[PDB]
Amino acid sequence: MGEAEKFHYIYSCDLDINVQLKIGSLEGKREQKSYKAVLEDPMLKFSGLYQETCSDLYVTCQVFAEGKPLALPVRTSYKAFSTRWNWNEWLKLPVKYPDLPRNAQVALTIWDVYGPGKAVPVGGTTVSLFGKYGMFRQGMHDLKVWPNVEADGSEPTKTPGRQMSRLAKLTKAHRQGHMVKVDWLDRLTFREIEMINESEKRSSNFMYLMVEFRCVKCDDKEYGIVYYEKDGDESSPILTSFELVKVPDPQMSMENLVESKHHKLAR
Amino acid sequence: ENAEWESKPPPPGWRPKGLLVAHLHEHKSAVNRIRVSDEHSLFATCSNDGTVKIWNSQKMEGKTTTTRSILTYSRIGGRVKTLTFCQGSHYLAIASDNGAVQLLGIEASKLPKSPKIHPLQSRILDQKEDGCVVDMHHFNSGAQSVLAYATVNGSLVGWDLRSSSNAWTLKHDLKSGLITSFAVDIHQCWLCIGTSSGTMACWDMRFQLPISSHCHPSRARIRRLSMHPLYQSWVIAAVQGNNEVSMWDMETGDRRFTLWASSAPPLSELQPSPHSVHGIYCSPADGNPILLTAGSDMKIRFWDLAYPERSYVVAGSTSSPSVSYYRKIIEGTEVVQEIQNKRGPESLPVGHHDIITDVATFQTTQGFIVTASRDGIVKVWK
Amino acid sequence: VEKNRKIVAENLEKVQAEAERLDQEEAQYQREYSEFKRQQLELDDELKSV
Amino acid sequence: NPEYDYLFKLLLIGDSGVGKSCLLLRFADDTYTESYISTIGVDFKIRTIELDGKTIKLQIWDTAGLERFRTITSSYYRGAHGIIVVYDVTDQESFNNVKQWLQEIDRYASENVNKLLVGNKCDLTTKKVVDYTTAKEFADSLGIPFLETSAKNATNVEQSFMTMAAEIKKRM
Amino acid sequence: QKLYSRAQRHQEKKEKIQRHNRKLGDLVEKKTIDLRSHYERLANLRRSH
Numbered sequence: 001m002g003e004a005e006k007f008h009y010i011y012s013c014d015l016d017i018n019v020q021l022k023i024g025s026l027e028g029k030r031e032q033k034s035y036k037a038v039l040e041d042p043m044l045k046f047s048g049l050y051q052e053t054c055s056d057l058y059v060t061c062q063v064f065a066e067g068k069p070l071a072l073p074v075r076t077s078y079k080a081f082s083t084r085w086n087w088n089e090w091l092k093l094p095v096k097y098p099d100l101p102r103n104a105q106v107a108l109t110i111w112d113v114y115g116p117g118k119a120v121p122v123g124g125t126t127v128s129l130f131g132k133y134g135m136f137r138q139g140m141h142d143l144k145v146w147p148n149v150e151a152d153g154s155e156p157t158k159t160p161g162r163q164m165s166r167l168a169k170l171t172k173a174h175r176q177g178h179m180v181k182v183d184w185l186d187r188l189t190f191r192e193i194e195m196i197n198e199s200e201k202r203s204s205n206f207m208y209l210m211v212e213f214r215c216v217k218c219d220d221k222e223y224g225i226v227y228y229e230k231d232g233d234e235s236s237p238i239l240t241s242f243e244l245v246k247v248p249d250p251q252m253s254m255e256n257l258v259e260s261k262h263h264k265l266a267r
Numbered sequence: 268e269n270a271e272w273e274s275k276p277p278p279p280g281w282r283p284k285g286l287l288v289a290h291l292h293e294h295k296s297a298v299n300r301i302r303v304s305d306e307h308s309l310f311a312t313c314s315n316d317g318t319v320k321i322w323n324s325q326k327m328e329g330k331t332t333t334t335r336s337i338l339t340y341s342r343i344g345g346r347v348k349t350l351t352f353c354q355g356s357h358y359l360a361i362a363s364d365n366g367a368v369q370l371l372g373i374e375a376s377k378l379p380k381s382p383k384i385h386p387l388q389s390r391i392l393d394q395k396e397d398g399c400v401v402d403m404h405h406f407n408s409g410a411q412s413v414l415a416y417a418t419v420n421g422s423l424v425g426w427d428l429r430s431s432s433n434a435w436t437l438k439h440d441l442k443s444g445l446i447t448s449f450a451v452d453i454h455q456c457w458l459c460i461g462t463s464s465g466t467m468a469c470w471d472m473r474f475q476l477p478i479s480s481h482c483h484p485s486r487a488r489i490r491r492l493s494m495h496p497l498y499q500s501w502v503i504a505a506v507q508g509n510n511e512v513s514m515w516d517m518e519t520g521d522r523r524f525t526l527w528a529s530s531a532p533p534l535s536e537l538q539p540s541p542h543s544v545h546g547i548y549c550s551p552a553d554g555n556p557i558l559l560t561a562g563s564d565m566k567i568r569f570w571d572l573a574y575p576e577r578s579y580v581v582a583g584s585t586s587s588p589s590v591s592y593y594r595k596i597i598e599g600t601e602v603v604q605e606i607q608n609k610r611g612p613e614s615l616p617v618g619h620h621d622i623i624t625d626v627a628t629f630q631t632t633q634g635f636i637v638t639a640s641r642d643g644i645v646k647v648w649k
Numbered sequence: 650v651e652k653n654r655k656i657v658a659e660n661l662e663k664v665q666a667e668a669e670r671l672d673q674e675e676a677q678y679q680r681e682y683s684e685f686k687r688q689q690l691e692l693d694d695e696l697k698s699v
Numbered sequence: 700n701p702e703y704d705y706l707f708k709l710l711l712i713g714d715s716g717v718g719k720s721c722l723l724l725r726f727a728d729d730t731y732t733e734s735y736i737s738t739i740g741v742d743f744k745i746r747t748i749e750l751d752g753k754t755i756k757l758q759i760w761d762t763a764g765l766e767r768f769r770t771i772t773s774s775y776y777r778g779a780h781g782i783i784v785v786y787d788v789t790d791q792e793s794f795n796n797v798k799q800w801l802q803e804i805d806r807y808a809s810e811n812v813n814k815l816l817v818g819n820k821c822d823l824t825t826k827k828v829v830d831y832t833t834a835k836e837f838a839d840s841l842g843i844p845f846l847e848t849s850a851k852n853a854t855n856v857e858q859s860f861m862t863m864a865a866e867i868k869k870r871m
Numbered sequence: 872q873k874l875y876s877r878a879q880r881h882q883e884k885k886e887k888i889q890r891h892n893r894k895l896g897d898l899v900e901k902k903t904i905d906l907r908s909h910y911e912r913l914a915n916l917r918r919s920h
C-alpha cells in the first residue's frame with residue numbers, strides 16, 4: 001500500500017562530501033543568426049551560432065555566497081552535440097555541504113566558441129542551493145537561462161533560474177504522484193498545458209538548463225540535506241541576574257592576545 | 268475515493284408523499300436560494316427583500332407550534348441573491364446584488380438565551396470591476412475553507428475564510444455567457460460553469476485552467492448545475508424551457524439523460540415551453556438515483572432515474588390532469604418524457620402559486636423537502 | 650529593403666494595436682452586456698411572477 | 700465481462716522526439732503528422748484488439764520525454780502491464796538512454812512488467828545510425844522483444860502493440 | 872474589418888437590450904399596479920364575504 005511518512009534529513013554541516021550537480025540538457029532555441037551583425041563583425045560567422053545547429057556548448061558551474069565565489073568554476077567535459085544539447089554529466093563541485101552557507105548559489109554559464117581563444121556566454125542561470133526553508137534542492141530542476149550573459153553570482157542574483165512556470169511545477173508534482181490522478185481529467189488538462197507550452201515556445205526564445213541534484217540514500221531511505229551549523233542546538237545559557245556583576249565583560253578571563261603577540265616578537 | 272455526496276442522505280426508498288407541514292411567508296419578495304446546513308440543523312433562505320432568514324429544521328417536525336424563522340438578517344443591503352452555509356452551522360455566507368459578500372456567524376443557542384447573527388469578514392465588489400455575486404459555493408479543502416463565488420464580470424473567485432486572501436481566481440470567458448450557475452466536484456477536482464447562453468465550461472481545479480466548453484444545442488440558459496452523484500465527468504443541467512434537466516458528459520459533451528416535461532416533442536429546439544426547472548435535488552440514495560425538480564410550472568417533480576415510469580409529481584393537486592412518464596431514445600440520449608394523460612369545498616391547494624425558485628431537503632427524523640417561491644413563500648413538505 | 654521593411658513592420662504594429670483596442674472594447678462590452686443580461690433575466694422572471 | 704476479456708495498460712517511454720506520440724496516433728487513430736507538439740504530462744488512447752480469440756482493451760499511455768517535464772519519481776509506470784521503450788533509430792543518444800529508461804522501468808514499474816524496445820523512424824534509412832543488429836543484440840541480451848517501427852509509413856506499428864498484448868496475455 | 876462590424880453589431884445589441892429592459896421594467900411596474908388592484912379587489916371581496 002505504501003511506505004511510512006517519516007521525514008529523514010541530515011544536517012548540511014554533517015555531510016562532509018562534495019556537492020555534485022548534474023548538467024542535463026539545454027532546451028530551447030538560440031538567438032537565431034542575425035546576419036546584420038555578421039556584416040558588422042565578420043568574426044561572428046566563425047562562431048558556434050553560425051557554424052552548427054548545435055555547437056558543442058559547455059557549462060561552467062561555480063558556487064557563490066554573499067556575492068563571492070567559494071571556489072573555482074567547474075566545466076563540463078567536452079561532448080559533441082548534433083541535434084540536442086544533452087551533457088548528462090555529473091559535476092563534482094569543489095565545495096562540500098559543510099562549506100556551503102545558507103545563501104550559497106550555483107552560477108551556471110553556457111559557453112560557446114567565438115573565434116580562436118574566445119568563449120562567448122550563450123546564457124547564464126543561477127539557482128540557490130537551499131530552498132525557502134533551508135533544504136538543499138533535490139532532484140530534477142529546470143532553470144531559466146538568461147541570454148547572452150554569464151550567470152550572476154551576486155546577492156541577489158540578476159539571473160535567477162527559478163504560466164508555464166506554475167504549470168511545470170504542477171506537472172512535476174503530478175508525475176511524482178503528489179497530485180491526485182484523474183485519468184479523464186488529466187488527459188484533457190495536459191493537452192491545454194501542451195498548447196500553453198507551444199505558445200510559449202513560439203512567443204519567447206526562452207532556454208532551460210535542466211540540472212539535477214544527488215539524492216542521499218541510506219538503507220533505501222531518502223535524506224534531505226537541511227542547512228545547519230555545528231553547535232546550532234547550543235541555546236546559550238543566558239541568565240538575567242545582575243545582583244553583583246552589573247557590567248559583564250566578554251574578554252573577562254581570556255588570554256591577552258596583544259601581549260602574547262608581543263611576547264612572541266620580543267622574546 | 269471517499270467523498271460523500273451528502274452528509275445525510277435521504278431514507279432508503281424515500282419517495283416524498285408531499286404533505287405540507289409549514290407554509291412560511293416571511294419575505295416580501297422572491298426567495299432566491301435555500302441552503303441546508305451540512306448537519307441539517309438549519310436551513311436558510313435569501314430574498315429580493317434584502318433579508319436572510321435562518322430556519323430551525325428541527326422545529327418543523329411534528330411540533331409546529333410556531334414555525335418562525337429563528338433569525339433574520341437584513342443589514343447587507345440590496346437583494347440577497349445567493350447564500351451558502353460553510354460546513355458547520357456557525358458560518359453562513361450571503362451575497363447581495365449591490366456587491367457585498369458577507370460571512371455571518373450563527374450562534375448556537377440554548378432556548379433560555381436568544382440566538383443571534385454576528386457579521387464576520389465582509390467583501391464589497393466594485394460594480395464596474397467585479398460585479399455582484401451570481402453563485403457561491405463553499406467547500407473544505409482540508410487546509411482551507413474556500414468560499415468560491417462567481418461574479419457578473421466573469422470572475423470565479425476562491426476566497427479562503429480562515430485567511431482573507433484568495434486561494435484562486437478563474438476568469439470566465441464572458442464571450443461564453445453570463446455565469447448563471449456553477450457546480451463544484453465533490454472530489455474538489457474540477458468545476459463546471461453554466462452560462463446564460465447555455466455554455467457549460469469546465470475548469471481543472473488542480474491546475475486552475477479551463478479544459479472544456481460544451482454548449483447546449485439550443486443555447487438555452489442554464490438555470491442549475493449540479494454534479495452527478497455517480498459519474499464524476501457528468502454534470503446535471505436544468506435548462507430554460509421545457510422543464511429540461513439534461514445530463515452531460517463533460518469528457519465528451521454528449522447528452523446522456525434528459526428530463527422533458529413539455530408539450531414540445533423531446534429534445535426539440537423549435538418551440539420551448541416557458542417553464543424551466545429552477546432547483547434540482549439529486550441523491551444517489553441506495554444506488555438508484557432520484558432527482559427532485561421544481562420551477563416555473565410550480566410543480567415539484569420526483570424523477571426515478573432508475574425506474575422512470577414511477578416518476579411522479581409531488582406538489583400539485585390531483586384535480587390537475589394526471590401524468591405518465593416514458594423512457595425513450597431520441598438522438599441516442601435516453602429521455603424520460605412526461606406526457607399529459609388525456610369535506611366542505613375542494614380542499615385548499617397546498618402547492619405553490621408562483622414560480623418555485625429552489626428546492627432543498629433536510630433530514631431531522633424523516634426526510635423533508637423545502638421549496639421557496641417568487642412571492643417569498645417557503646414551504647416544508649413531509 | 651530595410652526601409653520598406655520598417656514601413657510594413659510599423660503598419661502591422663499599428664493595425665495590430667488597433668485589434669487590441671477593439672479587444673479591450675469588446676471586453677468592456679461583455680462586462681456591460683452581461684449586467685444588462687442579468688437584469689433582463691431577473692425582469693423576465695419578475696414579469697412571469699407578476 | 701461482455702465488453703472485453705482483458706485490459707492491459709501499455710506505457711510508451713523514451714526520449715523526446717522519438718515518436719512516442721506518433722506511434723500512439725498511428726495505432727489508435729491511424730494518422731500521422733509532422734507537427735511536433737511535445738507531450739507534457741500524460742496522455743492515453745484506447746484501442747480494443749482481437750488476439751487469440753480474446754477481446755483485449757488496450758489503454759496505451761503516452762508520456763513526456765522532455766527532461767523539463769520529467770522527475771526522478773514516476774507514478775506513470777504504476778499499473779502498467781507493458782512498457783514500450785522507444786528510441787529514434789536516427790538518434791544514437793536516444794538508443795543510449797534506453798539503458799536509463801530500463802532502470803526507471805526496473806525501479807518504478809512492476810517486477811514482471813513486459814518490455815519492448817522499439818526503434819522508430821526506420822523509414823529514415825539514409826539518416827539511420829543505430830543498426831538493427833546493434834539493437835537486436837542489446838535487446839536479446841536483456842530478453843526484451845525488439846521491433847523497428849515507423850509511425851510515418853505505418854511500418855510494423857500494429858505488430859509492435861500486438862506483440863506486447865500477446866506477451867502480456869501469455870503472462871496473465 | 873470584421874472586428875469593426877462586430878463592434879457595430881455589439882453596439883446595437885447593447886442599445887437593444889437597454890431599451891428592451893426598459894420595456895420590461897415599465898411592463899413589470901405597470902402590471903404590479905394592476906396586481907395591486909387585483910389584490911385590493913380580492914381583499915374587498917374576501918372582506919365582503
Ligand SMILES: Nc1nc2c(ncn2[C@@H]2O[C@H](COP(=O)(O)OP(=O)(O)OP(=O)(O)O)[C@@H](O)[C@H]2O)c(=O)[nH]1
Nearest residue numbers: 716717718719720721733735737738764849850851
Ligand atoms: N521520419 C519519421 N519521423 C517521425 C516518425 N515518428 C515521429 N516522427 C517525427 O518526429 C517528431 C516527434 O514525434 P513525437 O511523436 O511528437 O515524439 P514524442 O516521442 O511524442 O516526443 P515527446 O512527445 O516530446 O515525448 C514528429 O513530429 C515527427 O515529425 C517516424 O516514424 N518517421
Ligand SMILES: [Mg+2]
Nearest residue numbers: 719720738761
Ligand atoms: Mg508524446
